[PDB]
Design an enzyme around this catalytic site. Structure first.
Site, PDB file in Angstrom:
ATOM      1  N   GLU A   3       0.942  -1.103   0.095  1.00 34.41           N
ATOM      2  CA  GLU A   3      -0.087  -0.110  -0.151  1.00 34.41           C
ATOM      3  C   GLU A   3       1.023   1.179  -0.089  1.00 34.41           C
ATOM      4  O   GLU A   3       0.617   2.290  -0.857  1.00 34.41           O
ATOM      5  CB  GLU A   3      -0.902   0.063   1.118  1.00 34.41           C
ATOM      6  CG  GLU A   3      -2.024  -0.944   1.172  1.00 34.41           C
ATOM      7  CD  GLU A   3      -3.098  -0.761   0.029  1.00 34.41           C
ATOM      8  OE1 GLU A   3      -3.215   0.347  -0.723  1.00 34.41           O
ATOM      9  OE2 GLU A   3      -3.918  -1.560  -0.197  1.00 34.41           O
ATOM     10  N   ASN A  31      -7.733   8.809  -6.159  1.00 35.89           N
ATOM     11  CA  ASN A  31      -8.638   8.113  -6.780  1.00 35.89           C
ATOM     12  C   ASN A  31      -9.405   8.792  -7.726  1.00 35.89           C
ATOM     13  O   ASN A  31      -9.613   9.741  -7.675  1.00 35.89           O
ATOM     14  CB  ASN A  31      -9.418   7.280  -6.099  1.00 35.89           C
ATOM     15  CG  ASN A  31      -8.629   6.518  -5.004  1.00 35.89           C
ATOM     16  OD1 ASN A  31      -8.767   6.736  -3.902  1.00 35.89           O
ATOM     17  ND2 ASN A  31      -7.792   5.615  -5.462  1.00 35.89           N
ATOM     18  N   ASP A  49     -12.612   8.594  -8.229  1.00 36.89           N
ATOM     19  CA  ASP A  49     -13.778   9.032  -7.544  1.00 36.89           C
ATOM     20  C   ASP A  49     -13.664  10.380  -7.130  1.00 36.89           C
ATOM     21  O   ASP A  49     -14.678  10.854  -6.449  1.00 36.89           O
ATOM     22  CB  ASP A  49     -14.649   7.827  -7.056  1.00 36.89           C
ATOM     23  CG  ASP A  49     -13.760   7.473  -5.707  1.00 36.89           C
ATOM     24  OD1 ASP A  49     -12.816   8.029  -5.413  1.00 36.89           O
ATOM     25  OD2 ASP A  49     -14.305   6.458  -4.870  1.00 36.89           O
ATOM     26  N   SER A  68     -12.052  10.594  -4.179  1.00 35.84           N
ATOM     27  CA  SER A  68     -11.647  10.090  -2.746  1.00 35.84           C
ATOM     28  C   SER A  68      -9.901  10.145  -2.620  1.00 35.84           C
ATOM     29  O   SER A  68      -9.218  10.019  -4.044  1.00 35.84           O
ATOM     30  CB  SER A  68     -12.000   8.952  -2.383  1.00 35.84           C
ATOM     31  OG  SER A  68     -11.755   7.576  -3.028  1.00 35.84           O
ATOM     32  N   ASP A 116      -6.731   8.133  -0.806  1.00 35.86           N
ATOM     33  CA  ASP A 116      -6.082   7.141   0.302  1.00 35.86           C
ATOM     34  C   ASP A 116      -4.940   7.569   1.154  1.00 35.86           C
ATOM     35  O   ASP A 116      -3.954   8.299   0.550  1.00 35.86           O
ATOM     36  CB  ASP A 116      -5.509   5.965  -0.548  1.00 35.86           C
ATOM     37  CG  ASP A 116      -6.672   5.128  -1.167  1.00 35.86           C
ATOM     38  OD1 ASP A 116      -7.856   5.218  -0.816  1.00 35.86           O
ATOM     39  OD2 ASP A 116      -6.196   4.832  -2.355  1.00 35.86           O
ATOM     40  N   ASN A 123      -9.010   4.977   2.863  1.00 37.61           N
ATOM     41  CA  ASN A 123      -9.992   5.835   1.907  1.00 37.61           C
ATOM     42  C   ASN A 123     -10.875   6.719   2.403  1.00 37.61           C
ATOM     43  O   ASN A 123     -11.579   6.322   3.252  1.00 37.61           O
ATOM     44  CB  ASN A 123     -10.405   4.764   0.936  1.00 37.61           C
ATOM     45  CG  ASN A 123     -11.143   5.540  -0.195  1.00 37.61           C
ATOM     46  OD1 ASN A 123     -12.411   6.177  -0.254  1.00 37.61           O
ATOM     47  ND2 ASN A 123     -10.343   6.060  -1.247  1.00 37.61           N
ATOM     48  N   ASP A 135     -15.244  -5.202   8.882  1.00 42.75           N
ATOM     49  CA  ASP A 135     -16.461  -4.578   7.977  1.00 42.75           C
ATOM     50  C   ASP A 135     -17.264  -5.975   7.401  1.00 42.75           C
ATOM     51  O   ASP A 135     -18.263  -5.445   6.830  1.00 42.75           O
ATOM     52  CB  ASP A 135     -16.203  -3.568   7.062  1.00 42.75           C
ATOM     53  CG  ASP A 135     -17.437  -2.833   6.702  1.00 42.75           C
ATOM     54  OD1 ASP A 135     -18.042  -2.154   7.267  1.00 42.75           O
ATOM     55  OD2 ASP A 135     -17.579  -2.755   5.239  1.00 42.75           O
TER      56      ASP A 135
HETATM   57 NA    NA Z   1       0.776   3.151  -3.445  1.00 44.71          NA
END
Ligand code: NA
Ligand SMILES: [Cl-]
Ligand SMILES: [Cl-]
Ligand SMILES: [Cl-]
Ligand SMILES: [Cl-]
Ligand code: NA
Ligand code: NA
Length: 129
Positions: free
Chosen positions: A35, A46, A48, A50, A52, A59, A101
């Site tokens: 990550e 991103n 969209d 958003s 991260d 996110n 979740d």
């Molecule tokens: Na990355």
């Protein structure tokens, strides 16, 4: 902060992430590797709109507030900037909620694509833990 591999393993363990929701410490270290390359200051935008944030690339659509993700939630009840700190506590606390979740660590697409099914113990090999 750019953590070392074993340094991050130890910090994650101290904060109760090892074996959390059944995911061994190497899974968490592997996820952080792919990550963020262990860099707490990592961010990525991103399509969209958003973003991260942090070692586990959490996110803003669901998990933290950045003020710039319309219609989003803040389920970890944290500013996204808290996820960039050298102190990993907020990232760990939020990761615990994410992994609970329903989809486990598949929430992290990079974990599914690069860690799941692999010899994740290699990520903690040699570390004094
Ligand atoms: Na990355
Ligand atoms: Cl490494
Ligand atoms: Cl492991
Ligand atoms: Cl927002
Ligand atoms: Cl699971
Ligand atoms: Na960014
Ligand atoms: Na990016």
């Amino acid at each position: 902060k750019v953590f070392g591999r074993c340094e991050l393993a130890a910090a994650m363990k101290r904060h109760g992430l090892d074996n959390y929701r059944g995911y061994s410490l190497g899974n968490w270290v592997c996820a952080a590797k792919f990550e963020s390359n262990f860099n707490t200051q990592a961010t990525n935008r991103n399509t969209d709109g958003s973003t991260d944030y942090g070692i586990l690339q959490i996110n803003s659509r669901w998990w933290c507030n950045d003020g710039r993700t319309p219609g989003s939630r803040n389920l970890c009840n944290i500013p996204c900037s808290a996820l960039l700190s050298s102190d990993i506590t907020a990232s760990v606390n939020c990761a615990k909620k994410i992994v609970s979740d329903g989809n486990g660590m598949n929430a992290w697409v990079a974990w599914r694509n690069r860690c799941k099914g692999t010899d994740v113990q290699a990520w903690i090999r040699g570390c004094r833990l």
